[PDB]
Amino acid sequence: MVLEATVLVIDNSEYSRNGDFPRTRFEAQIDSVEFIFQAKRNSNPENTVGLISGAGANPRVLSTFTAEFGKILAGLHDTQIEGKLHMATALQIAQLTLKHRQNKVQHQRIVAFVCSPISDSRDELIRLAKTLKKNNVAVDIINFGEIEQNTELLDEFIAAVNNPQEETSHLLTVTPGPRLLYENIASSPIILEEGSS
């Protein structure tokens, strides 16, 4: 919704080669990202988007907060998929991006795609869940990596981040079978999100 800066975490993994979403999950993310950018822009023109990845041996800033849709897209061609995502750093890298923005009038928000069973420790990320809300960052976990037969670390994180605050975390679970990733996010709330001051 309005009055928001957005860090999109795109998951670069080899679990994004699963053709559970046609054709492949990575290429489904290519369409999805472009929409999410446009949607936030027409709601309120102070919304800008930055892009980070999981890619590398350590995640990386590919795009700083920018008003250009084409730089986000360009960032997607740049990043490789042999890389692999680790949650613990990806959360922290994103907060650093939220400290350098084009519009310091907006508020701080993360949207995170997960295509991977995250083998990172649950207990570790629970400390980081409590870091975000002190920095006044919310994270939305778009989850379809851990419905692949792993336990849900995510349930715990979403509850911990939630606190009376206008930035509110939201949990989406998406059906793994074919419906076209971009469609499932588009038809579900991405601008009907509401605050909890």
Residues interacting with other proteins, by CB under 8 A?
12, 14-15, 17-20, 24, 26-27, 30, 56-58, 60-64, 66, 71, 76-81, 89, 92-93, 96-97, 99-100, 148
Closer to other proteins at the Cβ: 30 or 174? Answer: 30
**Closest CB to other proteins among 1 and 51?**
51
Q: Is 3 left (phi over 0), alpha (psi -120 to 50) or beta?
A: left
CB of 160 to other proteins, least distance (A): 19
* 90/74 Cα distance (integer angstroms): 20
Q: How far is the CB of 174 from other proteins (least distance, A)?
A: 15
Closest CB to other proteins among residues 20, 193: 20
CB count within 10 Å of CB 9 equals: 24
Least Å distance between CB 19 and other proteins?
5
- Kindly state the smallest distance separating residue 2's Cβ from other proteins, in Å: 25
CA distances from 179 to 17, 81, 138, 176 (A): 17, 23, 28, 9
Sheet holding 61-66, edge to edge: 61-66, 49-53, 5-10, 108-114, 137-143, 171-173
Residue 88 or 191 having the CB closest to other proteins:
88
Tokens in use for 97? Answer: 């991006």
Rg of the Cα trace of the chain? 15
Which residue lies nearer to other proteins by CB, 1 or 8?
8
H helix or E strand, kind and range, residue 133: helix 122-135
Measured distance CA(190)–CA(37) in Å, rounded: 11
